[PDB]
Design an enzyme around this catalytic site. Structure first.
Site, PDB file in Angstrom:
ATOM      1  N   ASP A 149     -29.102  -5.695 -76.487  1.00 38.22           N
ATOM      2  CA  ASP A 149     -28.382  -6.320 -77.592  1.00 38.22           C
ATOM      3  C   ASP A 149     -29.181  -7.503 -78.118  1.00 38.22           C
ATOM      4  O   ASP A 149     -29.131  -8.596 -77.546  1.00 38.22           O
ATOM      5  CB  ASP A 149     -27.021  -6.788 -77.108  1.00 38.22           C
ATOM      6  CG  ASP A 149     -26.209  -7.454 -78.194  1.00 38.22           C
ATOM      7  OD1 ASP A 149     -26.607  -7.346 -79.371  1.00 38.22           O
ATOM      8  OD2 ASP A 149     -25.162  -8.060 -77.864  1.00 38.22           O
ATOM      9  N   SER A 209     -33.852 -10.313 -96.075  1.00 37.37           N
ATOM     10  CA  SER A 209     -34.275  -9.136 -96.816  1.00 37.37           C
ATOM     11  C   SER A 209     -34.473  -9.499 -98.280  1.00 37.37           C
ATOM     12  O   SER A 209     -33.798 -10.378 -98.820  1.00 37.37           O
ATOM     13  CB  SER A 209     -33.223  -8.032 -96.667  1.00 37.37           C
ATOM     14  OG  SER A 209     -33.492  -6.906 -97.484  1.00 37.37           O
TER      15      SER A 209
END
Length: 330
Positions: free
Chosen positions: A35, A199
């Site tokens: 994770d 992004s």
């Protein structure tokens, strides 16, 4: 040193991925959920409340000659999906794919919430976010990667998750045969303890690319892709009959649909998520309403590049003095 381990989807939907981890002496092998959005290595154990164990493999520290109680240490964690766990702490030897760390904090669960009990395939979590998020008190502990870093040939790990197929976590090296083209690296903020990056935009299907900054986290422990409501609406508007359902808890679409791809930007590069990766199947057994793999982050507080996005790429988690993230197509 290096390590290399195969990671395997837990079910036919790729809801999560499990990776075998050796703990203790003699080794006890547990299948952990790696994770990159948390920083605790915790396991089902001989200390876990018996009614909360239902098929998981347990770590038994009393059977490990290298286990040592970390005196006074406790841990307690709550995840973004509302699940939680807590317990005490041992140090022990932990190996992943041939890479060994001695003295790793292994957090032994005394209590786990219902979603953990109900998932017999996940024996615990191995956190790979920054150690500043580790919950051990009163002495915070380091992640497996943090402990291994100095010994690694290069201070990196990579995630290569499969679509409906196994994939690989590598530590200490970049497998140049595992991706196509080049790896595009992008800046990371560690201020929230995550692999947080920006992004450069998105496209839906064959549509034009929208240049826009989307800050979010690379999180292998989250199944879906959570993005701003504007982006998510633009995606689902291209699917006839798709709608956001408050009763189901997100966007659903007709199971008869063919989904468009979704592209996200990494610098000047582009990662394409095929439409099929966005199908999470019937909302309930036999239903013709299917659950979408791109969902709004509006109720979260952060955008999450979960498995839906990451499995479309070869992803480098670069833990150099200034961390960065790398993405390649594959």
């Amino acid at each position: 040193s290096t390590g290399s381990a195969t990671t395997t989807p837990i079910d036919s939907l790729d809801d999560a991925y499990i990776t075998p981890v050796q703990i203790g002496t003699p080794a006890q092998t547990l299948n952990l959920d790696f994770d990159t959005g948390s920083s605790d290595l915790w396991v089902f154990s001989s200390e876990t409340t018996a009614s909360e164990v239902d098929g998981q493999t347990i770590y038994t520290p009393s059977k490990s000659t290298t286990a040592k109680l970390l005196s006074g240490a406790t841990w307690s964690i709550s995840y973004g999906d509302g699940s939680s766990s807590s317990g005490d702490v041992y140090t022990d030897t932990v190996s992943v794919g041939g890479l060994t760390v001695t003295g790793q904090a292994v957090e032994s669960a005394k209590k786990v919430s219902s979603s953990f009990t109900e998932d017999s395939t996940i024996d615990g979590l191995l956190g790979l976010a920054f150690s500043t998020l580790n919950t051990v008190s009163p002495t915070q502990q380091k992640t497996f990667f943090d402990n291994a870093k100095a010994s690694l040939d290069s201070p990196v790990f990579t995630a290569d998750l499969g679509y409906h197929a196994p994939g690989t976590y590598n530590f200490g090296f970049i497998d140049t045969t595992a991706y196509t083209g080049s790896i595009t690296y992008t800046a990371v903020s560690t201020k929230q303890g995550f692999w947080e990056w920006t992004s450069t935009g998105y496209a839906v299907g064959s549509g034009t690319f929208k240049s826009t900054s989307i800050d979010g986290i690379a999180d292998t422990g989250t199944t879906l892709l959570y993005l701003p409501a504007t982006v998510v609406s633009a995606y689902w508007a291209q699917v006839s009959g798709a709608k956001s359902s408050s009763s189901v808890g997100g966007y659903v679409f007709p199971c008869s649909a063919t989904l468009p791809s979704f592209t996200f930007g990494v610098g000047s590069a582009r990662i394409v998520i095929p439409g099929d990766y966005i199908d999470f199947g019937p909302i309930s057994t036999g239903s013709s309403s299917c659950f979408g793999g791109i969902q709004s982050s509006a109720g979260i507080g952060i955008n999450i590049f979960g498995d839906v996005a990451l499995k479309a790429a070869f992803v480098v988690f670069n833990g150099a003095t200034t961390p960065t993230l790398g993405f390649a197509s594959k």
